[PDB]
Design a protein around this ligand. Structure first.
Ligand code: ANP
Ligand code: MG
Length: 285
């Protein structure tokens, strides 16, 4: 079902790539590593369109095949916890990617309760963290590295199933430091870097706090692990007060996983399968 789109159909579907925000009449959902992301409706499906690069800038045939083979891998990585890539476009001015629109947005927006949405229950946050780990495991099982794990790249479908997004885009970008591992900051590429970033997301899930805040002590959310180990604060102090069903036992279970993930030595962190085990045992009975 993965196919190509005419750049001029995507133009119509996005109201001529209306860069205005949706709230004022446009189609802009946001912007990240590859500029504006546009919302549209095509083939009886609400979609998210992402403009990678310009077709003129893809000059050499090596750059053409560097993106063709890169998109082949993305289109093949289909899983319950991965955003489905519907297609692409190359016949026009810009190289585009068409993803399935996730109606509940990103985990980042729901943790901050953007647009008046209700806060996620602790029961849902556990199922979301488990699904995200299942999606990361699918990538690692097939020898892939996401390289850009963060709450903004964990989307939620109609049933609040976790859908990892933007896989391979960081790979194509090299062809947001608050989530990156120490070895990732130094340029090292390893699936153990994803485990570290997933640990930061778990802290966001527990606290409902963003990974970085300029007017906050500490500024980086990953630094609160030092406050817990030094007995300056407890995990109970940081628990999202907007939850109504949190229990200290399972919360400390998820924090124990987040702690192991945030080991500075990449060999001390568990693999994604151990993360799956601990997250599944967290809700066992
Ligand atoms: N398929 C999608 N469905 C719904 N929302 C999406 C989808 N893809 C991206 N978004 C959201 O749209 C916004 C723009 O996406 P994006 O350009 O990826 O920014 P970003 O994720 O914050 N930074 P980055 O992913 O590293 O480029 C973010 O709030 C995303 O969570
Ligand atoms: Mg993203």
């Amino acid at each position: 079902r993965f196919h190509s789109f005419s750049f001029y159909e995507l133009k119509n579907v996005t109201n001529n790539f209306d860069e205005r925000p949706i709230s004022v009449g446009g189609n802009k959902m946001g912007e990240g590593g590859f500029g504006v992301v546009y919302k549209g409706y095509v083939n009886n499906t609400t979609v998210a369109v992402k403009k990678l690069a310009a077709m003129v800038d893809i000059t050499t045939e090596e750059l053409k095949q560097q993106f063709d083979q890169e998109i082949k891998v993305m289109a093949k990585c289909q899983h319950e916890n991965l955003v489905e890539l519907l297609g692409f476009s190359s016949d026009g001015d810009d190289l585009c990617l068409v993803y399935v629109y996730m109606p509940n947005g990103s985990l980042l927006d729901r943790l901050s309760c953007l647009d008046g949405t209700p806060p996620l229950s602790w029961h849902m946050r556990c199922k979301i963290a488990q699904g995200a780990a299942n999606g990361i495991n699918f990538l690692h099982e097939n020898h892939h590295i996401h390289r850009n794990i963060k709450s903004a790249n964990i989307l939620l479908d109609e049933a609040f199933t976790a859908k990892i997004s933007d896989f391979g885009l960081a790979r194509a970008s090299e062809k947001t430091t608050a989530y990156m591992a120490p070895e990732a900051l130094r340029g090292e590429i390893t699936p153990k870097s994803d485990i570290y970033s997933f640990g930061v997301v778990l802290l966001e899930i527990i606290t409902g706090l963003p990974a970085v805040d300029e007017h906050r002590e500490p500024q980086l959310l990953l630094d609160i692990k030092e406050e817990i180990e030094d007995e300056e604060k407890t995990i109970e102090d940081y628990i999202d007060k907007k939850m109504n069903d949190a229990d200290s036992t399972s919360v400390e279970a998820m924090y124990s996983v987040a702690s192991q993930c945030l080991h500075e030595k990449k060999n001390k962190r568990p693999d994604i399968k151990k993360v799956q085990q601990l997250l599944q045992e967290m809700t066992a009975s």
